[PDB]
Amino acid sequence: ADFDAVLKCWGPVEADYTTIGGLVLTRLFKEHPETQKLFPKFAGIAQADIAGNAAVSAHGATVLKKLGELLKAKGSHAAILKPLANSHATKHKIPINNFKLISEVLVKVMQEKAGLDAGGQTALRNVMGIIIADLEANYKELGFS
Numbered sequence: 811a812d813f814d815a816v817l818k819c820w821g822p823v824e825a826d827y828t829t830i831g832g833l834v835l836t837r838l839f840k841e842h843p844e845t846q847k848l849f850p851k852f853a854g855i856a857q858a859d860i861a862g863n864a865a866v867s868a869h870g871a872t873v874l875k876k877l878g879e880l881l882k883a884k885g886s887h888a889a890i891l892k893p894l895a896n897s898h899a900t901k902h903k904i905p906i907n908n909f910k911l912i913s914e915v916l917v918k919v920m921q922e923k924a925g926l927d928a929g930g931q932t933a934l935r936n937v938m939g940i941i942i943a944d945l946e947a948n949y950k951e952l953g954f955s
């Protein structure tokens with residue numbers, strides 16, 4: 811049910827993953843400035859210059875596309891999410907807490923831009939909690955605790 815609740819508001823997100831993606835990463839770097847150093851391609855860009863940066867928006871689209879693919883998948887999740895844990899722990903070196911930060915940014919962006927109401931916000935927090943718990947478990951399998 812919670813996946814369906816999010817999907818009832820996903821139209822404006824998938825309509826323009828680049829614009830919405832840029833809003834998400836811009837807001838992440840604004841509100842949680844310590845996250846910006848986790849993207850070496852973007853670390854050091856003055857905050858005022860992020861909203862208009864096309865590469866930031868393209869990278870925001872990547873996360874939103876993958877979340878959409880996690881919402882619409884008819885086969886194994888687990889198979890979509892294990893590779894994500896692997897790359898984020900071993901290649902990108904992203905501490906787990908950062909996933910909670912980006913999830914809360916997305917909740918707020920969807921409230922503002924995608925009509926996600928109180929119940930939908932709870933549903934999205936539940937979905938993101940499922941995802942984050944799986945990432946955390948897979949991180950631990952790799953030795954990250």
Ligand code: HEM
Pocket residue numbers: 845848849850851869872873876877893894897898902904908909912941
């Ligand atoms: C559930 C949340 C997230 C999803 C679905 C997601 C998804 C992705 C995907 C699909 C890629 C490209 C393929 C790969 O390398 O695995 C990627 C790359 C990356 N992600 Fe994430 N990500 C998430 C959260 C984060 C967070 C919280 C950060 C840092 C705050 C982060 C930082 C990165 C970086 C640095 C890359 C590499 C970008 C590049 O190659 O320039 N991701 N992510």
